[PDB]
mmCIF file of C-alpha atoms and ligand atoms in Angstrom:
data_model
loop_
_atom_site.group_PDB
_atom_site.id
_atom_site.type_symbol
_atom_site.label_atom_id
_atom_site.label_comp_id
_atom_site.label_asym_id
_atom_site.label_seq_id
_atom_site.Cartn_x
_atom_site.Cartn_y
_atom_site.Cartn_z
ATOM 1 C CA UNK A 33 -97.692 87.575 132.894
ATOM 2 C CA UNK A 34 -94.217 89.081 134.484
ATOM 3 C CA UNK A 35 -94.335 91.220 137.660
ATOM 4 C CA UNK A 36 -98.193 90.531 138.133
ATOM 5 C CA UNK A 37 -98.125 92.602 141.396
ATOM 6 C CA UNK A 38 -96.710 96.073 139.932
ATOM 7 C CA UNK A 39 -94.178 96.013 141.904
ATOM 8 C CA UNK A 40 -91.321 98.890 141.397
ATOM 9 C CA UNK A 41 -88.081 96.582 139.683
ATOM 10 C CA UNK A 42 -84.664 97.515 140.188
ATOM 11 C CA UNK A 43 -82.019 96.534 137.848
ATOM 12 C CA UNK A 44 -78.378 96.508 137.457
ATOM 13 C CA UNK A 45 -77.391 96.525 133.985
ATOM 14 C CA UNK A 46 -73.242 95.298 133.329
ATOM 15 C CA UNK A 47 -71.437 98.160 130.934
ATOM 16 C CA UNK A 48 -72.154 95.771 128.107
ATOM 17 C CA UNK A 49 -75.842 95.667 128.193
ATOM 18 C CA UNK A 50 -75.534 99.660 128.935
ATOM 19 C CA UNK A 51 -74.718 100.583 125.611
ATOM 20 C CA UNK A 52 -77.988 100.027 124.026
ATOM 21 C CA UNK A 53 -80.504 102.164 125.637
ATOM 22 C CA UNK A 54 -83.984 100.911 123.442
ATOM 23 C CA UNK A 55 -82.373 97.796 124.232
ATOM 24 C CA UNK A 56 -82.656 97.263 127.903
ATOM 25 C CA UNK A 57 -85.691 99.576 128.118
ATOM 26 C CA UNK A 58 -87.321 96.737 125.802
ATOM 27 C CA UNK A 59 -85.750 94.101 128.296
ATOM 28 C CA UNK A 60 -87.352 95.856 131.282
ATOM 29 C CA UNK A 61 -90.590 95.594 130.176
ATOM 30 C CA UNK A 62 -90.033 91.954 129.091
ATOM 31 C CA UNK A 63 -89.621 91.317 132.997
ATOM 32 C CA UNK A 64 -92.655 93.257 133.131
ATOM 33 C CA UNK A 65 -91.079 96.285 135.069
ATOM 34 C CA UNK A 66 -93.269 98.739 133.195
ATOM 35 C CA UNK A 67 -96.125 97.153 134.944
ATOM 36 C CA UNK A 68 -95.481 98.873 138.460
ATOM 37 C CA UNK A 69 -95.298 102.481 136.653
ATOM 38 C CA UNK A 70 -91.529 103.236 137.456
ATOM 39 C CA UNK A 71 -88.478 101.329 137.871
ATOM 40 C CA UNK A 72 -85.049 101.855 139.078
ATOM 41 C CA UNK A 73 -81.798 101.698 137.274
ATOM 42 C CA UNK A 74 -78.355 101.395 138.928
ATOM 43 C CA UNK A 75 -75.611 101.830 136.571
ATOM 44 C CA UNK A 76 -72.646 99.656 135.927
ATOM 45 C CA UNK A 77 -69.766 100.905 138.558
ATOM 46 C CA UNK A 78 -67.444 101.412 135.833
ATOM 47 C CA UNK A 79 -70.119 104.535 134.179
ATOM 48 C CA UNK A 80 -70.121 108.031 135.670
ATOM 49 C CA UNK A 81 -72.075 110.487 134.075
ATOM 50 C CA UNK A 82 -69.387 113.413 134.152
ATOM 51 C CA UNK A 83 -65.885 113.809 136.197
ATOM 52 C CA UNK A 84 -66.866 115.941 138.975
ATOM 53 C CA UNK A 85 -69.834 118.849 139.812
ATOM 54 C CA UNK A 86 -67.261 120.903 141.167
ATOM 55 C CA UNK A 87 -68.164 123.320 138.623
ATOM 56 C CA UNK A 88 -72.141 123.937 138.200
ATOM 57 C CA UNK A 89 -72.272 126.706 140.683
ATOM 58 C CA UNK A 90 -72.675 129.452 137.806
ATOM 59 C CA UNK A 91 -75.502 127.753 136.049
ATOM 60 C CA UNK A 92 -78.685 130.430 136.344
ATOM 61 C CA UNK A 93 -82.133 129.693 137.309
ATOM 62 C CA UNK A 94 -84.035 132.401 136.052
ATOM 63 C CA UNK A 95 -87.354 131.890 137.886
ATOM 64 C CA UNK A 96 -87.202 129.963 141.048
ATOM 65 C CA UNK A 97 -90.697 128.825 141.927
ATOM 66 C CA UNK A 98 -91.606 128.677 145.932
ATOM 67 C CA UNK A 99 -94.516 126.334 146.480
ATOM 68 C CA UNK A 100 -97.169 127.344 148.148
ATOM 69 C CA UNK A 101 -99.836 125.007 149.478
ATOM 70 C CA UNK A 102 -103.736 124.784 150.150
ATOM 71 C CA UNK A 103 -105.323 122.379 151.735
ATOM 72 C CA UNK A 104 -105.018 119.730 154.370
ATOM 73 C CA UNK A 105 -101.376 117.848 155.371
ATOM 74 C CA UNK A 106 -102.450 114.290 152.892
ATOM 75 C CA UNK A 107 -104.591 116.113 150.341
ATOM 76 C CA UNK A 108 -103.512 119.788 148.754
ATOM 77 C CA UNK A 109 -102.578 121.669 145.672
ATOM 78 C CA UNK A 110 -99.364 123.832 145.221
ATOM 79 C CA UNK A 111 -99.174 126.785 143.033
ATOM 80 C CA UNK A 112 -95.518 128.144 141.659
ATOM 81 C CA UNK A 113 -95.059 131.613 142.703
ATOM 82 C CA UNK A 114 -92.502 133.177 141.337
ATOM 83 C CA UNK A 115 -88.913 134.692 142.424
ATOM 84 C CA UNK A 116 -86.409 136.615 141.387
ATOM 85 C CA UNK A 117 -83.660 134.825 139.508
ATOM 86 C CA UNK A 118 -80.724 133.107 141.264
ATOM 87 C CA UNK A 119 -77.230 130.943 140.490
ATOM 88 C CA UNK A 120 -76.772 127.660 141.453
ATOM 89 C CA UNK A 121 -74.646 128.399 144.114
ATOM 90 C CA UNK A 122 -77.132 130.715 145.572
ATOM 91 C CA UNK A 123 -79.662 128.239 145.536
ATOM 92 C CA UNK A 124 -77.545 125.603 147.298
ATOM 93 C CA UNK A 125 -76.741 128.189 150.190
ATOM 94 C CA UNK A 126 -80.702 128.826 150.191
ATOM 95 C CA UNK A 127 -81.537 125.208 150.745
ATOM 96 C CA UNK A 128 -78.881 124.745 153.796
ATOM 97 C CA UNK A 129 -79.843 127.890 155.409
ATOM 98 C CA UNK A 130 -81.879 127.285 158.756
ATOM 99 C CA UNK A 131 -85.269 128.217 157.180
ATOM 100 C CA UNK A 132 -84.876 125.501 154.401
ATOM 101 C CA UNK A 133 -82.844 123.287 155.456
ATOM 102 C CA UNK A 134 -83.644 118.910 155.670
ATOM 103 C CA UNK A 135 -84.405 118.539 159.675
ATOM 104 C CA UNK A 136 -83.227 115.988 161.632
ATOM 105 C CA UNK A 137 -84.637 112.369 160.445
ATOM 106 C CA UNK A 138 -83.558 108.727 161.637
ATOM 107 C CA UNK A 139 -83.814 107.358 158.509
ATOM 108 C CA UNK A 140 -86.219 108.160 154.931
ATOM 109 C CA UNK A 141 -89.011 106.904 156.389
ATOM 110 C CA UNK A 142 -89.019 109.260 159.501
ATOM 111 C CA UNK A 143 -88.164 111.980 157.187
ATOM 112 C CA UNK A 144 -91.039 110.764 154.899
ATOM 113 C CA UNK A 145 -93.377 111.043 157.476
ATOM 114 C CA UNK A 146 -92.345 114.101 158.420
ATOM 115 C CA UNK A 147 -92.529 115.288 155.221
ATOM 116 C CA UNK A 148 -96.576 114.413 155.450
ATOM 117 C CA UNK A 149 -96.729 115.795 158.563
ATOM 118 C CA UNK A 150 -95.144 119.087 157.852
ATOM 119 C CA UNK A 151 -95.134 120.090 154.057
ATOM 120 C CA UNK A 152 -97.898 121.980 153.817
ATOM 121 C CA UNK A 153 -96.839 124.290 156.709
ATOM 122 C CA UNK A 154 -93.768 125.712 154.103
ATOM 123 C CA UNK A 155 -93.273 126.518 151.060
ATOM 124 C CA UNK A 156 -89.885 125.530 149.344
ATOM 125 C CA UNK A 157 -88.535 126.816 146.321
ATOM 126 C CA UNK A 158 -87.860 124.765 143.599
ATOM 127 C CA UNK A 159 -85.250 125.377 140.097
ATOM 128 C CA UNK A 160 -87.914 123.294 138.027
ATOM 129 C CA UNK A 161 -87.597 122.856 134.336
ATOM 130 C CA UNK A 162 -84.329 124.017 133.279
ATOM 131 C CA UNK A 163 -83.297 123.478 129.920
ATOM 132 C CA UNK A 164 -79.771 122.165 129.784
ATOM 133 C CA UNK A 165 -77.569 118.872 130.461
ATOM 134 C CA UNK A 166 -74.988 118.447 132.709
ATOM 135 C CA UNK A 167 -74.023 114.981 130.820
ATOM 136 C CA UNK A 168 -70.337 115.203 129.367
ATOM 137 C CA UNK A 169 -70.437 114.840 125.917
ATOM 138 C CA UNK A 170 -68.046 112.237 126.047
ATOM 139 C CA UNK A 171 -70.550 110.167 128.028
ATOM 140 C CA UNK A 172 -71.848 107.674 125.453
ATOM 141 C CA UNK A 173 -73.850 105.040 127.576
ATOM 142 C CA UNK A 174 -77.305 106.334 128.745
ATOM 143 C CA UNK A 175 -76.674 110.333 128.038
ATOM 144 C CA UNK A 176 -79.712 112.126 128.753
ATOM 145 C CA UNK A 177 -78.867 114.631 125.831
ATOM 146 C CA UNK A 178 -78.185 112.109 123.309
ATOM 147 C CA UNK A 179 -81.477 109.764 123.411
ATOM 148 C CA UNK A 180 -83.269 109.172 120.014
ATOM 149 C CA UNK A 181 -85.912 112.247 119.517
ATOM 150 C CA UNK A 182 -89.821 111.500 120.307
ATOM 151 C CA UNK A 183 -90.472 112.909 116.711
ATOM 152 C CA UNK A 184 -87.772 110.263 115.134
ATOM 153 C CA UNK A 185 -89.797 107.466 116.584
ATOM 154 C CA UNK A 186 -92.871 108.259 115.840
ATOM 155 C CA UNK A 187 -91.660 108.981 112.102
ATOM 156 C CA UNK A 188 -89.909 105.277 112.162
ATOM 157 C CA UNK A 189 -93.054 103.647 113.461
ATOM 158 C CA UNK A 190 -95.836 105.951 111.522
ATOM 159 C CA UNK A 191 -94.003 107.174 107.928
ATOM 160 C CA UNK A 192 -94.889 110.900 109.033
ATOM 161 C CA UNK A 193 -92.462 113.483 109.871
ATOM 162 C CA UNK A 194 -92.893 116.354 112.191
ATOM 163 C CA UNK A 195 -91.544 119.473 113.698
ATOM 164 C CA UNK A 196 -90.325 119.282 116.855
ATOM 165 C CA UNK A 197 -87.223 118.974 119.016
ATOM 166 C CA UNK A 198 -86.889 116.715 122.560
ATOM 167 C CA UNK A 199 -83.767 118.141 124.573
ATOM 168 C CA UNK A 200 -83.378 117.754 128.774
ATOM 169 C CA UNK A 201 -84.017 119.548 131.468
ATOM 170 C CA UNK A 202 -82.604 120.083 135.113
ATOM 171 C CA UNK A 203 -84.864 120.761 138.223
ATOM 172 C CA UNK A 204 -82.628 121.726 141.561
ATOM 173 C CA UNK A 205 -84.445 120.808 144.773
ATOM 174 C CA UNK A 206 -84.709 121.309 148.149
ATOM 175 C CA UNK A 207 -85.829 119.808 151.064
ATOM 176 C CA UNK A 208 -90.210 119.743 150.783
ATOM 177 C CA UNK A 209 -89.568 120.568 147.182
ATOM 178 C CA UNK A 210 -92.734 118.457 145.504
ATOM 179 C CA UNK A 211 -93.762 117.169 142.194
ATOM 180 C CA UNK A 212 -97.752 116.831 142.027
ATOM 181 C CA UNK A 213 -99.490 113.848 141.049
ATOM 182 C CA UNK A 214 -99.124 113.431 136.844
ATOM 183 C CA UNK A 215 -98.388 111.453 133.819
ATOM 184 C CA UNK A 216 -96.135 112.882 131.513
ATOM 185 C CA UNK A 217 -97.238 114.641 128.267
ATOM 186 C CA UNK A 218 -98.704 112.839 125.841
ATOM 187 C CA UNK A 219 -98.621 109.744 128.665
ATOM 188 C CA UNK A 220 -94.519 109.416 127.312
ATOM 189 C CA UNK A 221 -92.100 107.873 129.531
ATOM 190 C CA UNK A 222 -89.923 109.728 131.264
ATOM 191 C CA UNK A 223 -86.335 109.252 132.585
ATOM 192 C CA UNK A 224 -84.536 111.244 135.570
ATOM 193 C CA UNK A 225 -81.354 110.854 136.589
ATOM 194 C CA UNK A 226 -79.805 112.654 140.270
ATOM 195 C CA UNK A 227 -76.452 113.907 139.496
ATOM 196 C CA UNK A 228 -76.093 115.006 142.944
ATOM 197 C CA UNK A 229 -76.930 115.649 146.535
ATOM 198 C CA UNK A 230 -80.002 114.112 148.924
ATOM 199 C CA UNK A 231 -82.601 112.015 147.438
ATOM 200 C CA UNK A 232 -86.008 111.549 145.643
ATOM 201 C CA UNK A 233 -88.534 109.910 146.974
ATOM 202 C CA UNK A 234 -91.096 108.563 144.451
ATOM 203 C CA UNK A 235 -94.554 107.633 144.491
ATOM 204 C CA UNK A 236 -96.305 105.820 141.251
ATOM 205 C CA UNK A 237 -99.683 104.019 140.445
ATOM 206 C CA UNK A 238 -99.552 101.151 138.029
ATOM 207 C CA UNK A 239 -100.584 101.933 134.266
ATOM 208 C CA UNK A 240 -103.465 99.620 135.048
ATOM 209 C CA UNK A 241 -105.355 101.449 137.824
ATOM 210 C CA UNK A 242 -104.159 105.311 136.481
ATOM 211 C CA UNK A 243 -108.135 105.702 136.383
ATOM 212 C CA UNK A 244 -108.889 104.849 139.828
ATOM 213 C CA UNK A 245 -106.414 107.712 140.983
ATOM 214 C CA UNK A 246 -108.320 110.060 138.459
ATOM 215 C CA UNK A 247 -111.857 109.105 140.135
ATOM 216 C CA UNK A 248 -110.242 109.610 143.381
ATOM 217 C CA UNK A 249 -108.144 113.056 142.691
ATOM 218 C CA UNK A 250 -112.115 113.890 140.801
ATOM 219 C CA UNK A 251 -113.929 113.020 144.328
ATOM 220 C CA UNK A 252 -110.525 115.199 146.538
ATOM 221 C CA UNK A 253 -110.895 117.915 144.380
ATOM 222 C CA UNK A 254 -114.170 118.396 143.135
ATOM 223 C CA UNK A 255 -113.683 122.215 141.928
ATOM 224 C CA UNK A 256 -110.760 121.858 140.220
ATOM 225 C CA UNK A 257 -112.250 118.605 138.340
ATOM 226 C CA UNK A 258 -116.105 120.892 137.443
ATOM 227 C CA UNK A 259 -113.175 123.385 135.817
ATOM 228 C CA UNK A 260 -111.297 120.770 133.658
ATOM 229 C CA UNK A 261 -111.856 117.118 132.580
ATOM 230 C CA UNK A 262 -108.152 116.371 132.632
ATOM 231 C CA UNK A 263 -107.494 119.062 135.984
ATOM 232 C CA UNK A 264 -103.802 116.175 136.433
ATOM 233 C CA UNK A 265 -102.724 117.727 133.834
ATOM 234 C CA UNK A 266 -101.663 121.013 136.050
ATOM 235 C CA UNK A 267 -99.507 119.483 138.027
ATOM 236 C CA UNK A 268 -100.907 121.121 141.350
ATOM 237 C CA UNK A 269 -102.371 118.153 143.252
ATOM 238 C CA UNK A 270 -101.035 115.941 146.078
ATOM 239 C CA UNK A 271 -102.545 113.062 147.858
ATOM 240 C CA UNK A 272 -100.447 111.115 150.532
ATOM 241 C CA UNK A 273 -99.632 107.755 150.586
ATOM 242 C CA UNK A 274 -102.108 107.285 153.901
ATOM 243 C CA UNK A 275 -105.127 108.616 151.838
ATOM 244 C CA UNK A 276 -104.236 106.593 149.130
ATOM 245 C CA UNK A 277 -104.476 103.762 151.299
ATOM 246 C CA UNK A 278 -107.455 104.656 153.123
ATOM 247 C CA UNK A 279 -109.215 104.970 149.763
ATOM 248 C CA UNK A 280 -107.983 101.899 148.488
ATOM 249 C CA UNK A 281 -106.000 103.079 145.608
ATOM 250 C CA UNK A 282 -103.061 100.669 144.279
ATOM 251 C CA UNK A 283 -99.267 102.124 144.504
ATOM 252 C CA UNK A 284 -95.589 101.945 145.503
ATOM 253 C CA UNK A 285 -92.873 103.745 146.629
ATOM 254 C CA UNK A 286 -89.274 104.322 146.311
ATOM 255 C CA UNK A 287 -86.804 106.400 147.024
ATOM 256 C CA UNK A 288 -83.705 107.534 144.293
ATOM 257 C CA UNK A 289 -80.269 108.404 145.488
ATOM 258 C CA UNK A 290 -77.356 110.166 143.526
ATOM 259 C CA UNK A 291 -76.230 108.351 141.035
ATOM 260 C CA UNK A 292 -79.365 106.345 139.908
ATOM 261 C CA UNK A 293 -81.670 106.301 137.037
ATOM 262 C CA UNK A 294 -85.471 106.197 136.846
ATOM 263 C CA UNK A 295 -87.922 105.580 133.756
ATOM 264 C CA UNK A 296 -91.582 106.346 134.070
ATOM 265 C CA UNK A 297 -93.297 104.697 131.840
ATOM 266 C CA UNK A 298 -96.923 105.458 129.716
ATOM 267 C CA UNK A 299 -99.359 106.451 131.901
ATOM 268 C CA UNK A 300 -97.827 105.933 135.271
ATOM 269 C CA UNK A 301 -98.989 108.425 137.584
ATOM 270 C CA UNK A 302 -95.973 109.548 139.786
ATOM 271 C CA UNK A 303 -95.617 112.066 142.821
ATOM 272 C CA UNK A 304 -92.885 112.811 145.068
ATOM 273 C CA UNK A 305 -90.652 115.390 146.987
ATOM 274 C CA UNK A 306 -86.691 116.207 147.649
ATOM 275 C CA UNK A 307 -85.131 115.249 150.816
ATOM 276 C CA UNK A 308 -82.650 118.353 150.476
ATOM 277 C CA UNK A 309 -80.156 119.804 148.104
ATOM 278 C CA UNK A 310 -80.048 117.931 144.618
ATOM 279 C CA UNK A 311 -80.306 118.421 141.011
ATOM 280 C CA UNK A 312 -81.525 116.016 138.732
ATOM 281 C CA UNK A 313 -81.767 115.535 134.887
ATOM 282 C CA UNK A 314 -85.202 114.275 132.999
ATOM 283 C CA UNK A 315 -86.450 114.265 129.510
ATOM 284 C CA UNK A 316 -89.401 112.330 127.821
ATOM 285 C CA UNK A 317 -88.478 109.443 125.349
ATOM 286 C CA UNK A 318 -91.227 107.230 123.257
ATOM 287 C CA UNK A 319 -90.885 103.724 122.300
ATOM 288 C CA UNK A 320 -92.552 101.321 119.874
ATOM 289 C CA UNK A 321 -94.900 100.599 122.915
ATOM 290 C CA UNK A 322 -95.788 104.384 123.468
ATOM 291 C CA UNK A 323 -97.413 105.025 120.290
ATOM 292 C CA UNK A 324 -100.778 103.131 121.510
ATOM 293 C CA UNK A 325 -100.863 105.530 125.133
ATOM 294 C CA UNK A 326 -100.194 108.356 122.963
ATOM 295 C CA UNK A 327 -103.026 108.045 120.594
ATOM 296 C CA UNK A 328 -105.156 107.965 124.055
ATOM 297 C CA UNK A 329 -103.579 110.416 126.192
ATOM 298 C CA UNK A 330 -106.420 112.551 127.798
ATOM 299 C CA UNK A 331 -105.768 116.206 127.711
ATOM 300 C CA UNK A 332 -106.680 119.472 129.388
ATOM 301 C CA UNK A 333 -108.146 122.144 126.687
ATOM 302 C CA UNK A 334 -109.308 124.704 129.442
ATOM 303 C CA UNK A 335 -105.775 126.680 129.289
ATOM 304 C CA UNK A 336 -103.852 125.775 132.336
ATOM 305 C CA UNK A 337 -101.485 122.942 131.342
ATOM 306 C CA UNK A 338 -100.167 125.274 129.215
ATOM 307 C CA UNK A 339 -96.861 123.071 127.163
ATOM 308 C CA UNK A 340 -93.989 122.954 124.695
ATOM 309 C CA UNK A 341 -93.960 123.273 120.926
ATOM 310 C CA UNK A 342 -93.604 119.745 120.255
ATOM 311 C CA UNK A 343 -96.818 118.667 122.015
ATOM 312 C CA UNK A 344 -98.360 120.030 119.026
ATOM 313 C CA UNK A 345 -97.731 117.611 116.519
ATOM 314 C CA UNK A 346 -97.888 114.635 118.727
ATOM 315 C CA UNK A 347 -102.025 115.842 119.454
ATOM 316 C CA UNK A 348 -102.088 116.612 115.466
ATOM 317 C CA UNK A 349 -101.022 113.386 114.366
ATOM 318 C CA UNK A 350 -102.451 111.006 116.643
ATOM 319 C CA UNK A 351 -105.222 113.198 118.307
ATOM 320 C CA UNK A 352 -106.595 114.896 115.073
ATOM 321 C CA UNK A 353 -110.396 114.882 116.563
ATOM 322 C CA UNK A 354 -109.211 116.760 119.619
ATOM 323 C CA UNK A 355 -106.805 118.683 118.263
ATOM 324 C CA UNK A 356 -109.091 121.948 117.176
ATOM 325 C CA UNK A 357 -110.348 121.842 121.021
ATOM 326 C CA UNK A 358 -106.399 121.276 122.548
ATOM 327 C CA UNK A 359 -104.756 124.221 120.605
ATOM 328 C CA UNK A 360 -107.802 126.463 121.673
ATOM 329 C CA UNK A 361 -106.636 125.925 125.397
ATOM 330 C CA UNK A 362 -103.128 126.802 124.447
ATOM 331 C CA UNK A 363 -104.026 129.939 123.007
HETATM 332 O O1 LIG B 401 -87.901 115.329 139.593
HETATM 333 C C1 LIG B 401 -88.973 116.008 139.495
HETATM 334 O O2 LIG B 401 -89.270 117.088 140.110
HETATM 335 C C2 LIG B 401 -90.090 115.552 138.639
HETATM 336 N N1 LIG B 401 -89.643 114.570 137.629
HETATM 337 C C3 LIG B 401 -90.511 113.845 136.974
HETATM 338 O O3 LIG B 401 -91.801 113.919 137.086
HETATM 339 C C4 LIG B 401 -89.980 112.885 135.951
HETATM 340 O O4 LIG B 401 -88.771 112.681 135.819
HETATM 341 O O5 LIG B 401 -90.904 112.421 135.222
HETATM 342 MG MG1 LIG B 402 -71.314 126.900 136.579
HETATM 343 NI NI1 LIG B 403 -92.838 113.146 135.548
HETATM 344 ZN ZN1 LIG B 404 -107.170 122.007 132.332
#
């Protein structure tokens, strides 16, 4: 069995094995990278994603969300309040002002550790979940807008065909900026590439021991699980990599500069937070190997998680007993 330990793989594809994207995702997980929950891509140095970002300072975010925390510094929910729209450019001036600006730091593990230390006494505001691309469309290697659709594969592997479109989005982050413990919908992979500015730092728990973080998050928030048998799905809790520990709970870390790639795959649970100023690109993609996570995926039917159009034929088709129950909660 390849990469028995889950540990996070890095890979450095040449511009000839970057041209087939189902391709060297397959290869991956043939080295077992899916295994670890996330790996790391580096691109060939010959590929750039567009010519400059000299120009991105007009793109809108129309609700900025500032995180607010409850709890204790390792274990805490965030909720999104909202704010009053603002450009890019106004955003980037926001996040190197003095009140939000990345502190002082040695190196990313004192500014991880500071980031435990600290979070919970701010609240950042994030430009989450912005539909758009800032791929060139002449970028034909890896474009985050050009991916085979989610409802394409599952109508190659299953004969049915669906509604539904799959397009990116762009989340511009700060420093504390925070993305709650989760698996993507539908327990798809993921991919999530930084265009730009200070890094990522990820956190991810094999595929194989996703259920011992659920019986822990149950025990760390025992309210929130009594409201909803699925209460991940919400995207509000955070547990730090010292509690993890202390409750014995497999997982990795890494952290993503500008310019990398990297894939999430079915039912890794991932976490993490900004170091400063970025942007970065994601979208959800399905494989062959998806299909089987799909057709498992837990979900929340109490109304919170709240999702996108497409999420509807994906619990129709291969979640027809819970379907009834899952489009009660999202209306
Ligand atoms: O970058 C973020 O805030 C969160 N991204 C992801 O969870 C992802 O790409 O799956
Ligand atoms: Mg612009
Ligand atoms: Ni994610
Ligand atoms: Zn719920």
């Amino acid at each position: 069995a390849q990469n028995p330990n889950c540990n996070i793989m890095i890979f450095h594809p040449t511009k000839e094995e970057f041209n087939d994207f189902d391709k060297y995702i397959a290869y991956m997980e043939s080295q077992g990278a899916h295994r670890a929950g996330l790996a790391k891509i580096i691109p060939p140095k010959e590929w750039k994603a567009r010519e400059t970002y000299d120009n991105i300072s007009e793109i809108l975010i129309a609700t900025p969300l500032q995180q607010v925390a409850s709890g204790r510094a390792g274990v805490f929910t965030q909720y999104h309040k909202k704010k009053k729209a603002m450009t890019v450019g106004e955003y980037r001036h926001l996040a190197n002002s003095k009140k939000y600006q990345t502190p002082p730091h040695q190196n990313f593990e004192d500014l991880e550790r500071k980031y435990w230390k600290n979070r919970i006494y701010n609240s950042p505001i994030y430009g989450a979940d912005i539909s758009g691309s800032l791929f060139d469309e002449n970028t034909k290697q890896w474009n985050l807008g050009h991916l085979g659709t989610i409802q394409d594969l599952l109508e190659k592997e299953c004969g049915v065909v669906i509604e539904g479109v799959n397009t990116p989005y762009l989340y511009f982050g700060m420093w504390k900026t925070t993305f709650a413990w989760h698996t993507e919908d539908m327990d798809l992979y993921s991919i999530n590439y930084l265009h730009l500015g200070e890094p990522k730092t990820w956190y991810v728990v094999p595929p194989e021991h996703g259920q011992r973080l659920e019986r822990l998050a149950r025990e760390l928030f025992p309210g929130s699980s009594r409201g909803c048998g699925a209460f991940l799905r919400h995207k509000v809790a955070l547990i730090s990599p010292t509690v993890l520990k202390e409750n014995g709970i497999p997982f990795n870390r890494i952290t993503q500069e500008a310019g990398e790639f990297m894939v999430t795959f079915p039912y890794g649970y991932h976490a993490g937070f900004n170091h400063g100023f970025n942007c970065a690109e994601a979208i959800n993609f399905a494989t062959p190997r998806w299909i089987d996570y799909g057709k498992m995926a837990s979900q929340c039917s109490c109304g919170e998680a709240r999702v996108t159009f497409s999420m509807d034929a994906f619990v129709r088709i291969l979640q027809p007993e819970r379907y009834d129950l899952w489009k009660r909660g999202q209306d």
